[PDB]
Design a protein around this ligand. Sequence first.
Ligand SMILES: O=C(O)CCC(=O)C(=O)O
Ligand SMILES: [Fe+3]
Ligand SMILES: [Zn+2]
Length: 427
Amino acid sequence: REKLNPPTPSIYLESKRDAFSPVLLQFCTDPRNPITVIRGLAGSLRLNLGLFSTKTLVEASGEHTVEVRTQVQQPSDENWDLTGTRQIWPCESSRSHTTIAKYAQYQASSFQESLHIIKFGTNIDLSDAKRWKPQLQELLKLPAFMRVTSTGNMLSHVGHTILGMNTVQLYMKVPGSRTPGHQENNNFCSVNINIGPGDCEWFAVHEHYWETISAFCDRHGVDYLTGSWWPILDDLYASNIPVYRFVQRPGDLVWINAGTVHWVQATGWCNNIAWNVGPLTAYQYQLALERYEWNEVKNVKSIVPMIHVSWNVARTVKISDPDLFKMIKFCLLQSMKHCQVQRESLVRAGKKIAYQGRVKDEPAYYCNECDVEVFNILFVTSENNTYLVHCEGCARRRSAGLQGVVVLEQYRTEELAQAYDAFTLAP
Ligand SMILES: O=C(O)CCC(=O)C(=O)O
Ligand SMILES: [Fe+3]
Ligand SMILES: [Zn+2]
């Protein structure tokens, strides 16, 4: 009863100096704290939350696109079937698109009408640095490990944009607005700040229980990884799964630790901003690679290209944690062997490989057909200036085989071997 309703790890920062303490990093990344709420963070850091107010956003970019989710308004601990007799797991929302100005008007008018179907403004893109300069500069006041960009954040070594992960997303909400259950892409940590003026209610389960939650989704007819679902709490309690529940008030920052399963509902009218962080720790990296592998089994795109990222961190960051070092070193070796096996079988087949190289800000490539990361050896076809990249398997599966397929190598064996050899444990 007490164990199934654990208290939520909470922190108040008395000053700006408290927020920059290494103890804060330690507490938030601790595998025992699946979720942390930092009360009054905006205040303690003198963050100008007014820069993300609905009025300021409309002024900044009122015609900016907003993905709208249309939903039935219901209590945060309920999700009813269509007949209204039964709780169900699937949480269905109509997708559509509007502008910030239009959602703003609905948000403002909704609020006055107070002084049942709703609309939730979701995944609003704040990536354009010029369009959102004062907003993004404000987030430089955060301690390094929570910033959008940082040397200790894996997402800062991708070398290019991953929308919604290493760029900020905005959510504009009215009461009842729901974000259904998920783990973050590749189990990365998440940062969320409530601009407010209202509250959000959060629900969270520790990473350890994710397979049981996955089994419920399958039992209840919805895809765990990609589907839209809202847990029935009695089902979780009956399975002895502790559920963290709390309110995030305006100015509160929520830190969602690696792999934490979470879902959220607005209690009032508010805006939230969010992004991902990948702290360079053994715990984060292991969870990120586990999901990377599981994603492949389930044919779900890994939005973080973990092989590309591992090479990049290997080239530029000094790793002192020996557990993390061993994990990365292994991944790198496995990557070199995979590339070697491909080159050898292509040479035995009599197929030429052109050296292409890498250019600045180049994306990581994925297979057109199956969405796996395609690292280094690229199987390229010409669709109709339209080049498509394929993995080895999908290329071989073509009816004419590798005829008409151009094979490109982005890193020579020696480039990889030399980066690998220079990757050593820092003291
Ligand atoms: O505020 C929201 O609805 C998004 C919550 C979330 O999933 C996150 O910040 O990771
Ligand atoms: Fe999330
Ligand atoms: Zn493929």
